[PDB]
Design an enzyme around this catalytic site. Structure first.
Site, PDB file in Angstrom:
ATOM      1  N   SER A 258      -4.204   4.965  -0.727  1.00 40.41           N
ATOM      2  CA  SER A 258      -4.129   3.750  -1.833  1.00 40.41           C
ATOM      3  C   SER A 258      -3.456   2.483  -1.425  1.00 40.41           C
ATOM      4  O   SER A 258      -2.141   2.749  -0.853  1.00 40.41           O
ATOM      5  CB  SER A 258      -3.825   4.022  -3.100  1.00 40.41           C
ATOM      6  OG  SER A 258      -4.528   5.103  -3.730  1.00 40.41           O
ATOM      7  N   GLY A 259      -3.902   1.343  -1.185  1.00 44.31           N
ATOM      8  CA  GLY A 259      -3.396   0.172  -0.663  1.00 44.31           C
ATOM      9  C   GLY A 259      -3.631  -0.045   0.795  1.00 44.31           C
ATOM     10  O   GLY A 259      -3.010  -1.058   1.222  1.00 44.31           O
TER      11      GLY A 259
ATOM     12  N   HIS B 127      -2.341  -0.023  -9.040  1.00 41.16           N
ATOM     13  CA  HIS B 127      -1.838   1.463  -9.641  1.00 41.16           C
ATOM     14  C   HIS B 127      -0.570   2.094  -9.204  1.00 41.16           C
ATOM     15  O   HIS B 127       0.071   2.559  -9.843  1.00 41.16           O
ATOM     16  CB  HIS B 127      -3.121   2.361  -9.703  1.00 41.16           C
ATOM     17  CG  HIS B 127      -3.480   2.758  -8.511  1.00 41.16           C
ATOM     18  ND1 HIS B 127      -4.406   2.226  -7.509  1.00 41.16           N
ATOM     19  CD2 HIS B 127      -3.120   4.031  -7.736  1.00 41.16           C
ATOM     20  CE1 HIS B 127      -4.431   2.761  -6.452  1.00 41.16           C
ATOM     21  NE2 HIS B 127      -3.681   4.024  -6.557  1.00 41.16           N
TER      22      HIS B 127
ATOM     23  N   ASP C 210      -7.508  -3.777  -8.855  1.00 41.90           N
ATOM     24  CA  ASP C 210      -6.476  -2.953  -8.272  1.00 41.90           C
ATOM     25  C   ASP C 210      -6.149  -3.761  -6.884  1.00 41.90           C
ATOM     26  O   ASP C 210      -6.259  -3.493  -5.814  1.00 41.90           O
ATOM     27  CB  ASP C 210      -7.216  -1.650  -7.845  1.00 41.90           C
ATOM     28  CG  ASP C 210      -5.908  -0.644  -7.299  1.00 41.90           C
ATOM     29  OD1 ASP C 210      -4.792  -1.060  -7.682  1.00 41.90           O
ATOM     30  OD2 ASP C 210      -6.158   0.386  -7.023  1.00 41.90           O
TER      31      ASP C 210
END
Ligand SMILES: [Ca+2]
Ligand SMILES: [Ca+2]
Ligand SMILES: [Ca+2]
Lengths: 377, 48
Positions: A326-327, A183, A229
């Site tokens: 995120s990630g 994303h 994701d």
């Protein structure tokens, strides 16, 4: 045995403890020594018990008042050195370091890339100066976090847009491939990856910024459920390993399910926000969170969770992943190496009781990552 | 023991120094307990 003079004269083993009951002490008096006091007085009536040496395979004997102890050497055991060690990864990890497997009552130890099998059959020897997974009152928005030290968190990288603003994290896996979230690719059209980052407002010279050349995303990505994701970034310039920049090893799915899934706690590092609807962290921050059972993970989640997601965090303590992470990779510290087991996916709020951060399962995408690292490599 | 004397202090024939504790009321006597040495070392029971 006992009399007015039987226990008043000189203490001699050729006198008291021999021709009656020899209840006690009269085997200890003669020598003044409580070491073989009860390792020999058991042999007054019924005869000896270790003289047969029931333990074979060069195993020593120990006499007890009713049962015999057989001390057999390393890898040898048994009631009389009779049973044998069943070589399986259930106990003592099968002596392996990274990958343990059991087959035909034998143990196969295999090491990942950058390590070679040692001739001692119990170790994996690194082949590089900086191998993967190796390290070489707090108020004002500090939710149980601690600051990463020099070389403590070298596998974390930051993604910066054209405005040089960090928005997502990334995992250092090799000299050209970075693992992040799918994303995040929709957040900025073009972005760069900075490795060795310690502070956004201060450059210590250990930060390397590289442009992103190749972007690979999962084809079955769903925006509504945030499923699948995962993203792979191939940078134009190579990444040079150093003190604050180190890669991370890729474990196996079966071995991760064998022992890594039962681990009590894991570590998540990133540059995410300190709390919900708050400012981004200026420095890299790491947090230790425990695993959550799948039943409570499904019961406490308002959305659909597939096999590629798992819950982590504290039910009561205000320690959970937030926006900006995120990630970021989830790392478990096995015997001598940090192994990646999860990727930060999302979370219903930050520092909220009864909510657990949902992390993407790396093991379900190991084959996809391996194909991506070789399709255009 | 031979040629040894001590003056009684308790009324009914008991030798003992009476120390003061807001008065002579204190008869500082301490009870001690003893068991056989080998059974106090290690056996199939708690020391007795
Ligand atoms: Ca005798
Ligand atoms: Ca004796
Ligand atoms: Ca004796």
């Amino acid at each position: 045995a006992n009399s007015f003079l039987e226990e008043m004269k000189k203490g001699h083993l050729e006198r008291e403890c021999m021709e009656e009951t020899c209840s006690y002490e009269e085997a200890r008096e003669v020598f003044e020594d409580s070491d073989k006091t009860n390792e020999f007085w058991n042999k007054y009536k019924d005869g000896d018990q270790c003289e047969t040496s029931p333990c074979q395979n060069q195993g020593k004997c120990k006499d007890g008042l009713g049962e015999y102890t057989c001390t057999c050497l390393e890898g040898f055991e048994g009631k009389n050195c009779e049973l044998f060690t069943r070589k399986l990864c259930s106990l003592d990890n099968g002596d392996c370091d990274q990958f343990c497997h059991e087959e035909q009552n034998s143990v196969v130890c295999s090491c990942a890339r950058g390590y070679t099998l040692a001739d001692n059959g119990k170790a994996c020897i690194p082949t590089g100066p900086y191998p993967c997974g190796k390290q070489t009152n707090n108020l004002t928005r500090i939710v149980g976090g601690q600051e990463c030290k020099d070389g403590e968190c070298p596998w974390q990288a930051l993604l910066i847009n054209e405005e040089n603003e960090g928005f997502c994290g990334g995992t250092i896996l090799s000299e050209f491939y970075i693992l992040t979230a799918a994303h995040c690719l929709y957040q900025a059209k073009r972005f760069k990856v900075r490795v060795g980052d310690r502070n956004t407002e201060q450059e210590e010279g250990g930060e390397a910024v590289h442009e992103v050349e190749v972007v690979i995303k999962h084809n079955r990505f769903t925006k509504e459920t945030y499923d699948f994701d995962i993203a792979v970034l191939r940078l134009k310039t190579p990444i040079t390993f150093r003190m604050n920049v180190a890669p991370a090893c890729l474990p196996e799915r079966d071995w991760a399910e064998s022992t890594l899934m039962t681990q009590k706690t894991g570590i998540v590092s990133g540059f995410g926000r300190t709390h919900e609807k708050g400012r981004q962290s200026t420095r890299l921050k790491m947090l230790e969170v425990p695993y959550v059972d799948r039943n409570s993970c499904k019961l406490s989640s308002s959305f659909i969770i597939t096999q590629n997601m798992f819950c982590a965090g504290y039910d009561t303590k205000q320690e959970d992943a937030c926006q900006g992470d995120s990630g970021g990779p989830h790392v478990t510290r096995f015997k001598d190496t940090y192994f990646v087991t999860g990727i930060v996916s999302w979370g219903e709020g930050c520092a909220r009781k009864g909510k657990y951060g949902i992390y993407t399962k790396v093991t379900a995408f190991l084959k996809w990552i391996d194909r991506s690292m070789k399709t255009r490599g | 023991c031979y040629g040894s004397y001590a003056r009684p202090t308790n009324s009914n024939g008991g030798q003992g120094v009476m120390v003061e504790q807001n008065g002579k009321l204190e008869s500082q006597v301490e009870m001690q307990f003893f068991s056989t040495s080998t059974n106090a070392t290690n056996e199939v029971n708690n020391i007795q």
